Structure formats: structure tokens, C-alpha cells
């Protein structure tokens, strides 16, 4: 069955989720909340920029600013040596 679980991939994916939660929670509260609500990592649905703004009461520009700042932040070899082997 080429459409079955490789069975190391599943546990690897679980570990991915766990280290991902770790690394995201290495940051502030608003940063993690923005990332999760943006990439559906808690409810499975990408919540758009304006919805993230309304759940924070700020502008779309505030949301994109925060997400872009966090994005530049995550892209470190520091924050990335742990992750990079998951792809």
C-alpha cells in the first residue's frame, strides 16, 4: 500500500509537533498566538490577518507586522538547528 503510514513518519510527525510547540513557546505570548492562529496549529484553520487583528483588536498592518517580525525571528540557525532535520 503506497497510501499507508510509513510508521516512522507518524512518530516523527508527533515529535515535530512537540518540538514545534517548544520552539514557538520560546517566544512571547502574542507572537505564539499570532503564529498559531495564522497557521491553524491549534484549530486546523488558518485565521486570516483581519481575524487575527480582531482577536487582538489591532489592524491588519499590526498583524502583518507582528507575524513578519516573528518570521524573521524564527529564521535563525539558533532556533532552527533543532527543526531542520524534520524535512
Amino acid at each position: 500500500d503506497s497510501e499507508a503510514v510509513v510508521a516512522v513518519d507518524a512518530v516523527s510527525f508527533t515529535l515535530l509537533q512537540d518540538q514545534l510547540q517548544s520552539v514557538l513557546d520560546t517566544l512571547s505570548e502574542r507572537e505564539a498566538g499570532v503564529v498559531r492562529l495564522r497557521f491553524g496549529l491549534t484549530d486546523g484553520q488558518p485565521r486570516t490577518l483581519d481575524e487575527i487583528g480582531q482577536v487582538y483588536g489591532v489592524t491588519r498592518e499590526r498583524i502583518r507586522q507582528i507575524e513578519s517580525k516573528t518570521m524573521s525571528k524564527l529564521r535563525h540557525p539558533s532556533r532552527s538547528q533543532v527543526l531542520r532535520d524534520y524535512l
Binding site: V8, V11, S12, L15, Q19, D85, Y86
Partner: protein
């Protein structure tokens, strides 16, 4: 159990992945998987620690009986062959002609517990069928111990007591000095000597004589005339066990291991079996059991025996030509004559071989092969079966050392191929019977420590003799042994 590291590294791959992610050799599980895929060097050192104390099973199809599966401690080995311990081949019915085994793996904690306590090897010594032992020594080691324990009178440095011109010159102050002597060229291993032992519980008689209560062996003293070989042998057995001082025939070794297993703990029976194995091989090599065609000695008076019986069968055939006896009569007469001839030849042959002939040393020691096969090597093949089942009235008259003739070999081929075909059909039908039996009795499991009935069959147990004696019944060991009395045996 031997185990190819290139195979253990694939069975235990999840275990080793975990153990080398715990160590900081790999950041994730994924890198460790790929690392095993590459076999980076330190993975082996991790594999050792994961394989420690983790028993693995070893099937061998066809799994006829309960010992087909056993659980060993895996230990790494070069190569790509599952090195098996030689004492379990009798249980697996596994020679090394290319047969292949299957390594399963127990996973759960309970599974490891089962494989460690129930299905371990050293705990399964005795056959569940008839309580005989199957870790018992065999083909090589039997010959080894036989040669080690036999007694060769007239051999080097024996106990030669004759004073007036010199001292005894047979006694050795202990097995230590005896071994020093034997390392020099003075004592042979088998020369009858008189050691002065202090570490082997003597036999029952000498024990009662010299000591009475119990000579607690430990540090005593006493002198028994034996070989050095028997001394080294009885050092293999435990301390408390009495001295043996016999010739370690296979039946004797079976009896000794039964005595051990029924009176000592299993963890001692296993270690003693292993020791007997080591000593058996080591003295097998020094035995010199080799088969050179200058040791397949033909019975020097085979010609005259054959000519006598040929006269007999020839007169039978001429009588047939007279019509005095019909076709079937002459066939049966010739058959009987050639059976008589085969007996005479076998008798002459056995009386001709010396007692240290390799081809007969192997057989007499009980190691392997019955006397018929030696009779076929040298002597006579006797009668060969027809393909139908009847005996060929020819009959074969040349031992394989002499080489046959064309017709002789062609007649032999009948019996050979019939044998192989019937073996196939028989091993196929035995499985049928076993399947029926497991069908019938799959639901007969012990469920109570005692039902507390009062009935129960009565067993023969060595019927009386006419002269007046208790001749032991022949088949008591299977009907009487291992039972629980219903009534109370009373005397007089």
C-alpha cells in the same frame, strides 16, 4: 545464540534509535533512522547496550514439538549466520546441512518475561514427551567423553605394584600431580592409576567405608584407583555428586544427567551439561576417530562363508530346476539362506574388528550409527528390497568398501528411492495426525490443584517372577514413573 550484527541492527532498530537519541548522538528520531541506514560507527556500540539481556526466539520450521521455539540471550557475531548452540540441535532436529532458523522478537514487558522464564533454553532440559534430557551430549562429545573415560590396560605409566626391586610407581599424590605427569610424557590420560583425591565425593561404598556418616567431601582424603581421565571427568560434575568410575557410554551419560536433573536445580544441570560439552569436544579431537579405507577392515574369511552359503542356495536352485519345489518355495528358501549368510558375515565381522577401531569405536560408544551400517561398509549388504516390498533373491554380496557391480547398485537403488519417497509421505501424514490430535485435545488444561477423587487405574510395576523375585517390568518408566498414588502401598 550467535547473531549476525547486520541482522540484529535491523531487528532492534527502534530500540537503538531510542537509545541513541537519548544519548546525544542524533538530534531527532529521524536523524537516528537515517544514521542506522548509513551505519555510522557508534551505532554498533549502542546496539550492544540495547541487545543486553533482551532474549530473542528461534523457531525452526517444521515446529514439531514444544521445543521448536526457544529463547536465548542474543550476543553479537561476525558473519551472517545465526550461530546456534550445539546442544539444542537435538531439540530442533536441526543438523547444519543448510537448515535455516527464524528469529522472532518479543516486545512487551510481559513478552520478555515469558521469553526469559518460560521459553529460555537453559530451563528446558528435559523433553516434555518422556522426561528424558535433550541437552544431553551427543555425536562428537559422546565420542569425546567415551575416549576420555575408557580404560586402556597395558598403557603408559599404569599402577604397576611390584616391590623388592622398586616401589609401586603408580600412585599420584593428587589429580594436580597427575595432570603435571600427563603434560609430560609419563601418564596417559587413560592408564589405570591410583590418585589421592580431595575434591570429589567418593562412591557410595567407599564413602560408607572410610567415613560412615558422610565424608563431607570438601577437604577430605581418600584414594580411588581410576584413570586420570575419569578424575577430570568427575571434576566436570558438581561437588556433591558421587564419583562415577565407569566408561562414559551414552546410556551412562543419559542416566547421569537424569540423576542430576531430578535431584539438583536446573541452573546446575545446565552448567554441568555445558561443561560436559566443552570437555567432550576437546577430547573428541584427541581421540583420532578418522575413517581411512585402511581402517574399514574386511572380514578376512568372507570368501569361504559366501561360498558355503552359495553351495546351499545353489543346491536349492537346482532342486527348483528339479521341480521339487515351486517358484515361491525357491524364493523363500534362497531368502532364508541369504539371511543366514548375512548373520554369519556380521558375526565374523564384529569378532574381527579390534575394540579401538574408529568405525567401531563410534558405534559401540553409542554416539551414532548401528552395527548394520558398519556391516554394509565392510562385509555384506545382504538382501535389497524389491520395489514392491519383497526381498530380491539375488542378493547383494559386496560391501561398499569393495565397491559393487552394476546390477548390484541398480538393485540397491530400488530400496533407496522407496525409502526417500516413503519418508516424504510419512512426514506428510504425521502432520495430519498431529493436527487431528491438537483438534481433539486443545481444551484439556489443568484447572485445579486437586479434584480429590478416589478412583484411578492400576499400573503393572514389575510383575512377579516364577522362580520368585521382582523382575522389573520392561515398560515401567513410562507407565509408572511420574504419577501420584491413589492408594497406599503397604508391605508384608
Amino acid at each position: 545464540c550467535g547473531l549476525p550484527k547486520l541482522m540484529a541492527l535491523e531487528l532492534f532498530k527502534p530500540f537503538v534509535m531510542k537509545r541513541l537519541v537519548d544519548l546525544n548522538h542524533a538530534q531527532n528520531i529521524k536523524s537516528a533512522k537515517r544514521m542506522v541506514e548509513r551505519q555510522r560507527p557508534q551505532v554498533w556500540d549502542v546496539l550492544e547496550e540495547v541487545i543486553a539481556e533482551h532474549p530473542v526466539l528461534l523457531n525452526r520450521a517444521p515446529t514439531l514439538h514444544r521445543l521448536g521455539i526457544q529463547a536465548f540471550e542474543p550476543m553479537l557475531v561476525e558473519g551472517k549466520a545465526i550461530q546456534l548452540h550445539p546442544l539444542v540441535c537435538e531439540a530442533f532436529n536441526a543438523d547444519f546441512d543448510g537448515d535455516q532458523m527464524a528469529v522472532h522478537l518479543p516486545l512487551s514487558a510481559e513478552a520478555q518475561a515469558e521469553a526469559r522464564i518460560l521459553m529460555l533454553s537453559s530451563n528446558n532440559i528435559l523433553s516434555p514427551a518422556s522426561g528424558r534430557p535433550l541437552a544431553m551430549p551427543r555425536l562428537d562429545m559422546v565420542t569425546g567423553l567415551y575416549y576420555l573415560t575408557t580404560e586402556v590396560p597395558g598403557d603408559t605409566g599404569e599402577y604397576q605394584p611390584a616391590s623388592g626391586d622398586h616401589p609401586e610407581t603408580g600412585v599420584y599424590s593428587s589429580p594436580a600431580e597427575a595432570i603435571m605427569a600427563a603434560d609430560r610424557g609419563v601418564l596417559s590420560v587413560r592408564a589405570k592409576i591410583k590418585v589421592r583425591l580431595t575434591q570429589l565425593r567418593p562412591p557410595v561404598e567407599i564413602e560408607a567405608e572410610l567415613f560412615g556418616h558422610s565424608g563431607w567431601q570438601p577437604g577430605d582424603a581418600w584414594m580411588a584407583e581410576t584413570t586420570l581421565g575419569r578424575v577430570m571427568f568427575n571434576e566436570l560434575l558438581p561437588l556433591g555428586y558421587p564419583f562415577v568410575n565407569k566408561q562414559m557410554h551414552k546410556k551412562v551419560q543419559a542416566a547421569i544427567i537424569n540423576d542430576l536433573a531430578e535431584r539438583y536445580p536446573m541452573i546446575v544441570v545446565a552448567q554441568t551439561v555445558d561443561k560436559l560439552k566443552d570437555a567432550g569436544f576437546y577430547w573428541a579431537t584427541r581421540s583420532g576417530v578418522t575413517v581411512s579405507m585402511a581402517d574399514v577392515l574386511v572380514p578376512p574369511r568372507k570368501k569361504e562363508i559366501l561360498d558355503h552359503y552359495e553351495e546351499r542356495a545353489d543346491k536349492v536352485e537346482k532342486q527348483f530346476q528339479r521341480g521339487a519345489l515351486n517358484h515361491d518355495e525357491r524364493n523363500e528358501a534362497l531368502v532364508e539362506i541369504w539371511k543366514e549368510a548375512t548373520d554369519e558375515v556380521g558375526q565374523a565381522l564384529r569378532e574381527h574388528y579390534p575394540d579401538d577401531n574408529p568405525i567401531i569405536t563410534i558405534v559401540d560408544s553409542g554416539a551414532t550409527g548401528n552395527f548394520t551400517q558398519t556391516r554394509t561398509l565392510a562385509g555384506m549388504k545382504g538382501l535389497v528390497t524389491n520395489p514392491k516390498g519383497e526381498f530380491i533373491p539375488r542378493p547383494v554380496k559386496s560391501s561398499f568398501r569393495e565397491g559393487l557391480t552394476v546390477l548390484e547398485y541398480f538393485i540397491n537403488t530400488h530400496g533407496a528411492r522407496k525409502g526417500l519417497a516413503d519418508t516424504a509421505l510419512r512426514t506428510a501424514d504425521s502432520g495430519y495426525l498431529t493436527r487431528r490430535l491438537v483438534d481433539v485435545s486443545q481444551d484439556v488444561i489443568v484447572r485445579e490443584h486437586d479434584c480429590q477423587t478416589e478412583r484411578g487405574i492400576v499400573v503393572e510395576l514389575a510383575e512377579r517372577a516364577p522362580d520368585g523375585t521382582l523382575i522389573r517390568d520392561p515398560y515401567i518408566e513410562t507407565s509408572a514413573y511420574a504419577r501420584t498414588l491413589g492408594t497406599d502401598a503397604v508391605d508384608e
